[model samples]
Target: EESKIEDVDKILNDILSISSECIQPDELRVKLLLKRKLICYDGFEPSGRMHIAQGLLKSIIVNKLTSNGCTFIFWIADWFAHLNNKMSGDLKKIKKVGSYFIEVWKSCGMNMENVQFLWASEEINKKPNEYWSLVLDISRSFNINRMKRCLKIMGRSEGEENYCSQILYPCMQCADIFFLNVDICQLGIDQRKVNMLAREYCDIKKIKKKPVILSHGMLPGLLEGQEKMSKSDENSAIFMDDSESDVNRKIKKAYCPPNVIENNPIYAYAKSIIFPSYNEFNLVRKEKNGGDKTYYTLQELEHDYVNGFIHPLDLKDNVAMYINKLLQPVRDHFQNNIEAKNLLNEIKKYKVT
Candidate 1:
């Protein structure tokens, strides 16, 4: 086959912007040049409400990656959620929440052409022998102490109290990569340790092929402390189906300091979400306040923001508008589709933990 090295460059360039880090880019390039059907894996636990980061930013990144010649598989980790005690450890509620999360993605204009969803419970149950063997192999490969260090992947610190099943989550996650024949571990940065577990397991087994880790950046909550958006904290994130008034109120109250970009959730939204979804960011303001301005790139916006050319209030207004625009279809979906509407209602009634 003729070299598609240029295609590899293009794909990597796009991937780099979306991800916080990509382990072994050189290997990824080689795989691309060989014209292999690269498969990227992303897993999410069906916990509770679908936030904008999970709903909108996720769709944006998946669409970009798939269009760039990678098939995306979403691991709906219902069993994992149950093990983590989500929805009071009710498997039925977890499954329902998973469906609700998928409905958000389906309505948010994610490209389903090259994307597929696999439920952890359904898939593992089909081949329990094979799946359990892999899980056990992975668990045995690492000591309990090493496994404890990877607990952050499931939202638990190493020192946090956890059930025996909780300890099995990282093992199952590592096994998932090989089980699915995943070429890329395209998950959030929080899951980096478990992704590394898959790599180390491959190394110990003398398997030359290891999944590339493409850990994406997590969006900060709308509140302070720069923490990740939490489902339990409704004000920390803008939900996909949140009303326009709610979004505007949240954005207005969002922690954004003037001329300071770092740790600013408002700017974070614009950089990650707004820029990816729209061609240009338009900030409308009065003539006295430098009039209406449009930024075509994140750098330009950042430059203006740092120079005090833009006010925090104006930035909030624009970001809120774009966020609402992106979520309109999602809200419409839950409103019009009876199945989705009911699913969302049922999910809302469940306890977050």
Candidate 2:
């Protein structure tokens, strides 16, 4: 028997409240046969430094998907970086960025072997004709409207139509799906349009495309509730490399409204992503609180908070503790890892002597 959509839905919602704009319940059922064997792909453009939100999302999804028998691929999208002029046209710099991402993943407790990290340039160059063919095919199938929608999430506007790179960006992303033989592309909800383009590309080529699964992660920003979190907005983001003092300051000053349940990224991070061994914590809460208010797990915490059983402050304090503890390993790893130390030095190489 195929895995029920209800079962998958429960797991996904429990994890991050992921929803789909395109794939329906009936389609999900049909897709289940391919679901378990799915190669889940999530690629990052190493344009900027890693942040807390990135770490939180990766830690939860990568661990859960790996444990549930899915092969996860973390693609360092250096090629896209080059295409966007983010990199200084140096392969070594890209490799260094890739290495940093892997270190972050390891610090977050992701099983390195279960997750394959590939540099997009290396992967593309290794099989140029194959990748180019796939790209061409995808370009042919996808219309400008779909492609525009995909780039819009990346902050590209509608009037930016003359740029060739913007036009072809979706095609290249679709090529990653094909090149990796990925069954499902897992990403934040903002990338739903991009994933859909991949699905459409696969269909055009008559290749089996896995359905896209989106994680409804919290979007932190200037406004208390926003559609997306951006590192460009300094006030709204907490970077991974930030010091303990930085974290404490950011959280204290964060725009967490009292008793507001929806669109609070900090609460979402605490209840859904961080806090391993949440069952023990929840059991304690349940025993003390009585009735269904007891949360023996992160899922229960989310349920209670969303349903108004627990106050937002209580949730924030708990989440703050959990995140602080969770980030300790990463803090220690950066301090100890000679490579990371060297990379930090390199990033500051041009400073005054």
Candidate 3:
């Protein structure tokens, strides 16, 4: 069953308002109507630990979209890892990463029944003539400048100048969409331009593809507000496997300012990801205040903050408590699962193998 425009609007506005900069409002509304029988796709290059920032946001969005009748595909991006030199052509490492990815998703509470994990290597190697031919065709349609612009959006600095893989990677990514035959693509804002290219390729080729994309804002790094949280940056993110003390410590040192609501990733996660619906967040706010007055949406909260009706500290505490509760299940799941233990061991073996 397809979701109505009202249903998607309720989901979008509830999670985070799709900024006009990222998407045209009218285009988004139109896309929603076509989103019936939509297949939402998001992939991650499994280079390191699955951090809280990544897993938490993806899990929340996947759950919300799935609840709204969207079929979601969660790709491991193992091929991208190999392409970027993370896997170093090791088949075992690729399998290890793929397994780890499943554990992370299960730990984070995503429904496995509605989701499928795909390995780009397997897709390309086993069906080279078919998949690679599509890749070549897509590449022929794009030029250096267009590819460069897309890579730039991904923060690929050297690639803009002299990286063959960088030039060809977009083709592979776009081909993924063509193969999936999905109705919509949901990715982080960082991948907006790449998705746009896929949308364009789908159009020019007359492929029945006009996937509406929904890109969420990136999560901020812990202790530093400059960049998105990354697993390699030890002090910068909390992993799904992080203990309760680890979560508390990281949040305590997180770079959330006193009054400012924007760019504080922690608050953004709470407002956008956890309490996704206006009603859900308002219920949280009202419950916290123990007040009879009703606050219905995130917009109302922001308005109150701007009008000096609610203090920022109160909001931050609410966000903190909300996040703690939201992650508690993931923490518990990881602790109890023996597969998770094996997954960790496999990842560690990757360092030597």
Q: Top TM-score: which candidate number?
A: 1
Tens digit per residue, CA lDDT, model 2, 33-150: 4465457778887666666657765766677666656678888888776565454645566566667777777787774667888889888999999999988877777678767778
**Model with the higher TM-score, candidate 1 or 3:** 1
Displacement of the residue 164 alpha carbon in candidate 3, Å: 1.4
Q: Distance from true position, residue 141, model 1, in Å?
A: 0.8
The residue pairs found clashing in candidate 1 are none
Q: Write the per-residue lDDT of candidate 3 for residues 21-52, one digit (tens) a residue.
A: 33444555565566555677887877767776
Best prediction by lDDT: 1
* Model 2: lowest-lDDT 10 consecutive positions: 279-288
In Å, residue 19's CA in model 2 sits off its true spot by 5.8
Residues 194-217, model 1: lDDT tens digits: 888888999999998888898888
What are the models' TM-scores?
Answer: 0.96, 0.80, 0.80
Superposed Cα deviation of residue 169, candidate 3 (Å): 1.5
Q: List the residue pairs that clash in candidate 3.
A: 14-276
